[PDB]
Ligand binder design. Structure first.
Ligand SMILES: Cc1cc2nc3c(=O)[nH]c(=O)nc-3n(C[C@H](O)[C@H](O)[C@H](O)COP(=O)(O)OP(=O)(O)OC[C@H]3O[C@@H](n4cnc5c(N)ncnc54)[C@H](O)[C@@H]3O)c2cc1C
Ligand SMILES: Cc1cc2nc3c(=O)[nH]c(=O)nc-3n(C[C@H](O)[C@H](O)[C@H](O)COP(=O)(O)OP(=O)(O)OC[C@H]3O[C@@H](n4cnc5c(N)ncnc54)[C@H](O)[C@@H]3O)c2cc1C
Lengths: 289, 285
């Protein structure tokens, strides 16, 4: 029965050093700037492995990422990783960014391709190229993106998995997944990563669902399937944030309990600059002050 | 394991089976508590519960107060409201007066319990008594982890069957956290021939100090994992509500999968967790 195997899984979660990383995005107003620093001081007591700050491809808010990453190291002492994108800049520009990050104190970069505006011919620049360039400059710990449900522009699922191995070969040593809700398809993909020869954990990116209409927006660009029961679980909650936050805690803690049973001990949270759900999920993981 | 919680969630979202829920409130003892109670009632009423119910402080003498909340709920909302009644502090004739007056209000369901004096009068005796006044639907208490004063599990079970044969037709459990034990208890009730649902009393754990208090009187066991899940959260209401959501909705998803379509919520006069738990079951405005 289900009763005996949720009581075992609760007690297993009740000895392993779990590692957690938090992703923040650069804010754009004084409301969101305050929401972000609230979250940073709340979450720091869990001693995360690192925290990261996303990067506006062509948003012009490229300079905001670098300043936050410096301020986090300053005022909290957490290791902070900028994300960095390729399509926006020339190699000289990227080598200068990388050089200054390294002389700054930054040891981990999250290296991504970025997306061209919708409808644009793609530039023959890819993430493996940014990884090679970053390793030209210094010994960066480098984190790259994996797509358990295949990246929407990939030639094939085979080619996208070969690409991930290619990014590891170029020198990336940390892997973070796109968010997902099919836990079984993540596990299967994780094993394919061990088959091809990738030796770091395929670290799951956990996205707490606090606004469903926003999730429908994000998940359309990205090819991740939204299960039917999740759509049902959120119908009628458009003006009920309190219920949304509770439905979300159960969903995310279910995920994270199940990944933990299957031997995932590394979690990357898309906090969207809020702290409520990430703190509680970590808490239920045993990641506590 | 993963396909286990995925098909679990897709049976909770696919079941068109009518799920009967009911909410328990307690009589407020100040102005704050009263505002809280009435916002809960107006927030939970849209979900169309089978009934709502209002507890009774045995020796308190607040029985006029329990009766007052009940009449008020029926007038303001339309809900079927059910009083809790205890026969431990009242003479039998008083109890018959209380029942006739309840019946002329339009009350049709009474939750009938012994209560505890701080008398050889048991709950099956109050059930016989109510039933001689009128054709009440009567709900009674069941104890999956044995009532602390029973000599034995089998005797506490024989007792519960005595209350059914005495005229009751609804069963509501003390709260619990060992679900496998609840399921084995419901099997025994089936065997010994009780023909109503053994309806789970769901208690959302919004405050673990309060739960520690309620659970000492009651011989109800707190799992080691439940203590762990609340360690360090004395001053974190936000994290406690989120932790409580995951605890309740696992319990309710499993119970629902095993065929239990009837839930009774110990709302503790707050509506946040109950409205969310019902929402996930498919109970919606
Ligand atoms: C954890 C995470 C963090 C992210 N952070 C950011 C961020 O800060 N800013 C931002 O703008 N975006 C960010 N993204 C989004 C990301 O930029 C997009 O998903 C983008 O569309 C792909 O980026 P990539 O780094 O995975 O590129 P790549 O790994 O290069 O792959 C992209 C696509 O190109 C294909 N491909 C790879 N190599 C070749 C080749 N040689 N020839 C042909 N096709 C090839 C792949 O199969 C895939 O379809 C993030 C994504 C994740 C998962
Ligand atoms: C859903 C629910 C609602 C409640 N509401 C209230 C409330 O509003 N107010 C309140 O004060 N309390 C309330 N209680 C608490 C309840 O009154 C206590 O658990 C009380 O100790 C027993 O009540 P009961 O109706 O189950 O009694 P009983 O069914 O009579 O059981 C009491 C004990 O006596 C034993 N027993 C039964 N018959 C006999 C017999 N003939 N000879 C010897 N032993 C016997 C039983 O096995 C049991 O151990 C509630 C409990 C529940 C589960």
């Amino acid at each position: 029965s289900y009763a005996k195997e949720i009581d075992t899984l609760n007690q297993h979660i009740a000895n392993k050093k779990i590692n957690v990383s938090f992703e923040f995005f650069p804010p754009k107003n004084e409301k969101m700037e305050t929401l972000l620093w609230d979250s940073i001081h709340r979450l720091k007591v869990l001693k995360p492995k690192f925290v990261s700050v996303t990067y506006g491809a062509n948003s012009g808010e490229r300079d905001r990422t670098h300043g936050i990453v410096k301020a986090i190291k300053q005022e909290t002492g957490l290791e902070a990783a900028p994300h960095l994108t390729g399509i926006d800049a020339t190699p000289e520009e990227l080598k200068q960014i990388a050089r200054d990050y390294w002389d700054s104190g930054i040891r981990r970069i999250v290296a991504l391709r970025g997306d061209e505006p919708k409808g644009y011919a793609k530039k023959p620049f890819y993430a493996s190229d940014l990884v090679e360039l970053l390793r030209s400059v210094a010994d960066f710990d480098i984190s790259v993106a994996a797509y358990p449900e295949v990246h929407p522009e990939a030639k094939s699922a085979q080619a996208d998995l070969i690409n991930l191995k290619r990014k590891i070969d170029a020198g990336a040593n940390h892997v973070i997944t796109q968010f997902f809700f099919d836990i079984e398809n993540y596990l299967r993909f994780r094993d394919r990563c061990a088959s091809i020869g990738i030796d770091t954990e395929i670290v799951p990116g956990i996205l707490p669902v606090t606004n469903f209409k926003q999730l429908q927006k994000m998940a359309s660009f990205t090819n991740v399937k939204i299960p039917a029961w999740l759509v049902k679980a959120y119908d009628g909650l458009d003006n009920d944030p309190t219920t949304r936050n509770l439905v979300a805690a159960s969903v995310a803690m279910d995920m994270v309990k199940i990944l933990s049973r299957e031997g995932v001990n590394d979690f990357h949270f898309y906090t969207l600059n809020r702290s409520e759900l990430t703190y509680a999920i970590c808490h239920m993981l045993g990641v506590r002050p």
